[PDB]
Structure 1
Amino acid sequence: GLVRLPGLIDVHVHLREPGGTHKEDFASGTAAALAGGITMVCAMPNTRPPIIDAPALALAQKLAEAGARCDFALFLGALSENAGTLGTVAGSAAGLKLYLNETFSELRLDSVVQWMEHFETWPSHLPIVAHAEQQTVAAVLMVAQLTQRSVHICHVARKEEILLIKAAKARGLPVTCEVAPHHLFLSHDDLERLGPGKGEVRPELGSRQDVEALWENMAVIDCFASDHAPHTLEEKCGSRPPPGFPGLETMLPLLLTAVSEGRLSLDDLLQRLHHNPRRIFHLPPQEDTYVEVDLEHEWTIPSHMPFSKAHWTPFEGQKVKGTVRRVVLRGEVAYIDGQVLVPPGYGQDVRKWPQGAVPQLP
């Protein structure tokens, strides 16, 4: 007895093309998405070249249209000197990403004044998302208030962060957030097994109290998003390990296991992987699109999942209950039981669909 789910949406993935294609490309990363029950992804802009102007966006659009197997939208990235220059292309992007802390990015902003300049110049009806850890969450919320608009907080990982967001929502402030599976299912207790290279991620893995606080405050979490951040094992275990975990192929199995245990409901999962992504990012429906899952099948996560070029996973050894059996995307069988059945290039840029433009006042 399979359960039919709508097409799930991951609003935070790194597909590494252009410029990091040994780690992942559009074709391999979207294969990983489909195998994880994800039919639409929003790809981050910290590529090489980074997606920080109209020419880079045009390149990335063509690479994605040629390589993606599922549908997508592409983020633009903020830089210290590109505020006020993105207006002609802003509506074609998923949103604008701000990198406000140290991480795997060359995009960090130098001054809160540059955050203000972006919030003032980026069109007010279009999404802004931020990598903002600890007190940076409070700082970016202040900038959003000064400029009288909303903000979405990426990968919330700490008790401190979720309680600050909770307090802001209680005051009626327009803030949303997402949580990644590693911050729900891994902690400091896993660092001995992972070791110091594999364990590198931003935000870093939290304490048991951080993990417990995210679960206790599920009502505050608007979305789940993988922050799929593939790097090869050689890179993770070398002299200067980059932070990040692959996650597309493991996210839905981990969350289905939690549903089976009664830790959240099926509806709670679908709000966070379908309805709230749609409404926060103004992403369009996908016609004739659904995911069939088997909630009974028990399995153990192996040392690498089949599709991601990262070829490793921090969830190795965890026992899960739930698997993706079939995905149909826009009327075509896209995935069955380990086989991807749509070619590179089947996926489309949802921002080019009439229904994928963000409504605005004239």
Structure 2
Amino acid sequence: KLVRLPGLIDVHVHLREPGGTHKEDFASGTAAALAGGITMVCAMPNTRPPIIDAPALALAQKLAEAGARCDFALFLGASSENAGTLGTVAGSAAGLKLYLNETYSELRLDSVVQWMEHFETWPSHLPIVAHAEQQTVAAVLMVAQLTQRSVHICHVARKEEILLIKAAKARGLPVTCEVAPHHLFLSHDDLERLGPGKGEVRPELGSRQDVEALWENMAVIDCFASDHAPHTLEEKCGSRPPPGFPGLETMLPLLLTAVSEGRLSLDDLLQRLHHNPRRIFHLPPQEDTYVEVDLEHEWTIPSHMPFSKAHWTPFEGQKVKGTVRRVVLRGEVAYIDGQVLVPPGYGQDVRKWPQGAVPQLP
């Protein structure tokens, strides 16, 4: 009755430690990952302090090693000050993250020349991912071509963006992309229900036509990734609502529902949550690691999932078919039926494994 899946990989999570641990920490966020059938996460650098230099990375690595329940890699973040300074720690990170749209964090870049400087100085064999919306997708593709390297586009959300990426792939350009579940399963039609606070997310929810274009262009989507962006309900409903949705615990059930309806195949799902994350980010295999799912169980998403400290979900009320029953991580039962059974600190930094280093020429 159960289907065995390999250990799934989420290449875009915000786990809020250090500095935002009321929203999530490594222990709670990786519990959420495990309950979602995810055994490896790549954590974004917009923490407090942000992971924009070697001391911050070193702190974050130890916090993750002590708190993570599944395996992980940590992104470095590009800043207006750190191009040309990250070479000695670059290979220990998941990759470099560029935040190219609205932000007031230390991740704000003022000029496309600063993007160029990062593409020129970051080691050419290591991943670069960009938060790049609408025309910014075309702009960062131009910078990638000028510097003769690849780029990965985070959370593609619009018809405009997926068609631009499709055209770039047709010209043989080295671009990959990911899509998040809220841009496949929510739209403007859901904003009345969500309200303006909860509904705040970046990239924003798309139109019905945006959602339909992403499904129609599934072949263009290399990865699914949650952009798990936990904020508390108080924050989402307050005066200055921060953008983002929690998503680790709902991603796989939503996508399994779509598989059961014939909207994509099981293989399509596994390419996008396992094989392509591995190959784009050079993430290592996890020995004796698998996920068992029950594809027949129908349930309704509640007002909050059990594990994320966000304690809310924008998918409340959606009917799904598919549920994670058991997760085994490196030979240990990590999750069964609503209970996480590996402690904080069980998880490891996959970039320290010999198989987890990105290959490079001498």
Q: Offset of 1:102 from its aligned partner?
A: 1.1
Q: What percent identity do the matched residue pairs reach? A: 99
Contact 2:79 2:106 (C-alpha < 8 Å) held by counterparts:
no
Q: Which runs of 4+ in 1 moved over 2 A?
A: 103-106
Give the whole-Å Cα distance in 1 for the aligned partners of 2:41 and 2:61. Answer: 13
Q: Offset of 1:159 from its aligned partner?
A: 0.1
Give the whole-Å Cα distance in 2 for the aligned partners of 1:118 and 1:104. Answer: 19
Task: Provide structure 1 residue ranges, at least 5 long, that are not aligned to the other structure.
Answer: none
- Give SS of 2:48's match: coil
Q: Offset of 1:104 from its aligned partner?
A: 7.8
Q: Offset of 1:81 from its aligned partner?
A: 1.3
- Give SS of 1:328's match: strand
- Give SS of 2:322's match: strand
Taking a change above 3 Å as real, the CA distance of residues 178 and 104 of structure 1, as seen in their structure-2 partners, is farther
Give the whole-Å Cα distance in 2 for the aligned partners of 1:20 and 1:246. Answer: 14
- Give SS of 2:152's match: strand
Q: Offset of 1:105 from its aligned partner?
A: 4.3
Contact 2:101 2:132 (C-alpha < 8 Å) held by counterparts:
yes
Q: Deviations for 1:253-312, whole angstroms, at most 9, x for unmatched residues?
A: 000000000000000000000000000000000000000000000000000000000000
Q: Deviations for 1:65-87, whole angstroms, at most 9, x for unmatched residues?
A: 00000000000000011100000
Give the whole-Å Cα distance in 2 for the aligned partners of 1:23 and 1:105. Answer: 17
What is residue 29 of structure 1 aligned with on the other side?
29
Give the whole-Å Cα distance in 2 for the aligned partners of 1:3 and 1:321. Answer: 14
Q: Offset of 1:216 from its aligned partner?
A: 0.1
Contact 1:137 1:161 (C-alpha < 8 Å) held by counterparts:
yes
The TM-score normalised by the length of structure 1 is: 0.99
- Give SS of 1:194's match: helix
Give the whole-Å Cα distance in 2 for the aligned partners of 1:132 and 1:276. Answer: 20
Contact 1:103 1:243 (C-alpha < 8 Å) held by counterparts:
no
What is residue 346 of structure 1 aligned with on the other side?
346
Give the whole-Å Cα distance in 1 for the aligned partners of 2:201 and 2:103. Answer: 8
Contact 1:131 1:154 (C-alpha < 8 Å) held by counterparts:
yes
Q: Deviations for 1:191-236, whole angstroms, at most 9, x for unmatched residues?
A: 0000000000000000000000000000000000000000000000
Contact 2:35 2:335 (C-alpha < 8 Å) held by counterparts:
yes
Contact 1:17 1:48 (C-alpha < 8 Å) held by counterparts:
yes
Q: Deviations for 1:159-203, whole angstroms, at most 9, x for unmatched residues?
A: 000000000000000000000000000000000000000000000
Q: Deviations for 1:334-359, whole angstroms, at most 9, x for unmatched residues?
A: 00000000000000000000000000
Give the whole-Å Cα distance in 2 for the aligned partners of 1:337 and 1:164. Answer: 42
Contact 2:65 2:348 (C-alpha < 8 Å) held by counterparts:
yes
Contact 1:32 1:249 (C-alpha < 8 Å) held by counterparts:
yes
What is residue 186 of structure 1 aligned with on the other side?
186
Give the whole-Å Cα distance in 1 for the aligned partners of 2:327 and 2:301. Answer: 20
Contact 1:296 1:321 (C-alpha < 8 Å) held by counterparts:
yes
Q: Offset of 1:28 from its aligned partner?
A: 0.1
- Give SS of 1:56's match: helix
Q: Offset of 1:157 from its aligned partner?
A: 0.1
Q: Offset of 1:106 from its aligned partner?
A: 3.9
Give the whole-Å Cα distance in 1 for the aligned partners of 2:194 and 2:39. Answer: 30
Q: Deviations for 1:96-143, whole angstroms, at most 9, x for unmatched residues?
A: 000000158441210000000000000000000000000000000000
RMSD: 0.6
Give the whole-Å Cα distance in 1 for the aligned partners of 2:82 and 2:339. Answer: 42
Give the whole-Å Cα distance in 2 for the aligned partners of 1:131 and 1:69. Answer: 27
- Give SS of 1:141's match: helix
Task: Provide structure 2 residue ranges, at least 5 long, that are not aligned to the other structure.
Answer: none
Taking a change above 3 Å as real, the CA distance of residues 105 and 305 of structure 1, as seen in their structure-2 partners, is farther
Contact 1:104 1:242 (C-alpha < 8 Å) held by counterparts:
no
Give the whole-Å Cα distance in 2 for the aligned partners of 1:270 and 1:109. Answer: 35
Q: Deviations for 1:300-337, whole angstroms, at most 9, x for unmatched residues?
A: 00000000000000000000000000000000000000
Contact 1:304 1:313 (C-alpha < 8 Å) held by counterparts:
yes
Contact 2:156 2:179 (C-alpha < 8 Å) held by counterparts:
yes
Give the whole-Å Cα distance in 2 for the aligned partners of 1:171 and 1:82. Answer: 32
The count of aligned residue pairs is: 361
Contact 1:130 1:151 (C-alpha < 8 Å) held by counterparts:
yes
Contact 1:104 1:243 (C-alpha < 8 Å) held by counterparts:
no
Give the whole-Å Cα distance in 1 for the aligned partners of 2:125 and 2:283. Answer: 13
